[PDB]
């Protein structure tokens, strides 16, 4: 209930309208995840008078997974969460090519709400 208070309330990203309930509203922790789908599905220039706002992932669509690409995707995600969504940190973003039916890059972006492992010596030479 307090997460709905501290994190703001706003509309759902696919605008669903009904005569019974006026506007469907996403609130709280679901509102932060709703804004992160907005950011990476937008593209800079597509919002009038807001040209800074966008994820920019269309830069990487014919770019050969060669691991110069996967560092560029990591930095574009990390920067755009800084500029346009400081309500949610970043934990890690893991990018893998799809093993079945390749040429799909799958990125799992893990956020926050906002020791050297000594045991491995007993399993090495």
């Amino acid at each position: 209930d307090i997460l709905k208070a501290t994190l703001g309330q706003c509309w759902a990203f696919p605008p669903r309208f009904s005569p019974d309930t006026g506007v469907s509203l996403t609130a709280g922790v679901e509102a932060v995840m709703q804004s992160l789908r907005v950011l990476f599905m937008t593209e800079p220039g597509e919002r009038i008078m807001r040209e800074s706002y966008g994820g920019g992932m269309h830069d990487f669509i014919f770019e050969n997974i060669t691991d110069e690409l996967l560092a560029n995707i990591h930095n574009r995600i990390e920067e755009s969460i800084l500029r346009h969504e400081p309500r949610a940190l970043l934990k890690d973003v893991i990018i893998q090519p799809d093993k079945q039916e390749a040429s799909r890059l799958r990125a799992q972006i893990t956020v926050y709400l906002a020791n050297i492992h000594d045991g491995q010596t007993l399993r090495l030479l």
């Binding site: 691991d67 110069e68 560092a71 020791n115 050297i116 492992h117 491995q120 010596t121 090495l124």
Partner: protein, 224 residues
């Protein structure tokens, strides 16, 4: 030694305030420094007195104790699997200005049995830091670091006030020896307090009768 033979790394703890109330992050660094160095320095200025009776020099300020220390990180040998950027994302963070307050982080360096200047820890803030990566990979994950830390003394105010009351806490409680006298008992009470305790005030504060009243084993209380 005396129990076992495992190493004790050094640990760099960080706070935000001068005291230990608000902890920031805290890392332990692998590959011990091989050599520490802590330099003391005290500044004196010579008295250019016109009277020419004596040559002397005043005490102005004591410079803070600075610690120099050099580290090394490496992740390609097959015991080393954590990438060194996760280990350097803490040194670069803790030895810089914090985003919350706009200040350094009040670090505290510690080693298992090493006793720093007179305490088991070395407080202070980071004057200097320089990372120089020397090896890389094809995509250039770095995996060789060579860090060159440098700190200052800056202890907290509760620890510095506690060390002051342990030396002359404004009472003396001086025992008297056999064959004693109040000019000697004032020199032995003026060394506990370092304040020249002027023997007539000793016989008034302790209710002496005739300036030779103590009897070889009783105590005399000296305040200031």
């Amino acid at each position: 030694s005396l129990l076992e033979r495992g190493l004790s790394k050094l640990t760099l703890n960080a706070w935000k305030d001068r005291e230990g109330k608000i902890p920031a992050g805290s890392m332990s660094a692998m590959y011990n420094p091989e050599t520490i160095q802590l330099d003391y320095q005290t500044r004196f200025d010579t008295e250019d007195t016109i009277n020419t009776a004596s040559q002397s020099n005043r005490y102005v300020i004591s410079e803070p104790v600075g610690l120099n220390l050099t580290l090394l990180f490496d992740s390609q040998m097959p015991g080393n699997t954590t990438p060194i950027e996760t280990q350097l994302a803490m040194l670069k963070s803790l030895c810089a200005v914090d985003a919350a307050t706009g200040s350094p982080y009040f670090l505290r360096i510690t080693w298992g049995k090493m006793r720093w200047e007179n305490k088991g820890w070395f407080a202070g803030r980071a004057r200097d830091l320089s990372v120089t990566y020397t090896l890389f990979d094809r995509d250039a994950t770095p995996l060789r670091a060579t860090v060159q830390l440098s700190l200052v003394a800056d202890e907290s105010f509760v620890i510095q006030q506690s060390l002051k009351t342990q030396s002359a806490p404004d009472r003396a409680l001086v025992s008297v020896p056999d064959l004693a006298s109040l000019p000697l008992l004032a020199l032995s009470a003026g060394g506990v307090l370092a304040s020249s305790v002027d023997y007539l005030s000793l016989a008034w504060d302790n209710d002496l009768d005739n300036l030779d009243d103590f009897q070889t084993g009783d105590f005399l209380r000296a305040t200031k």
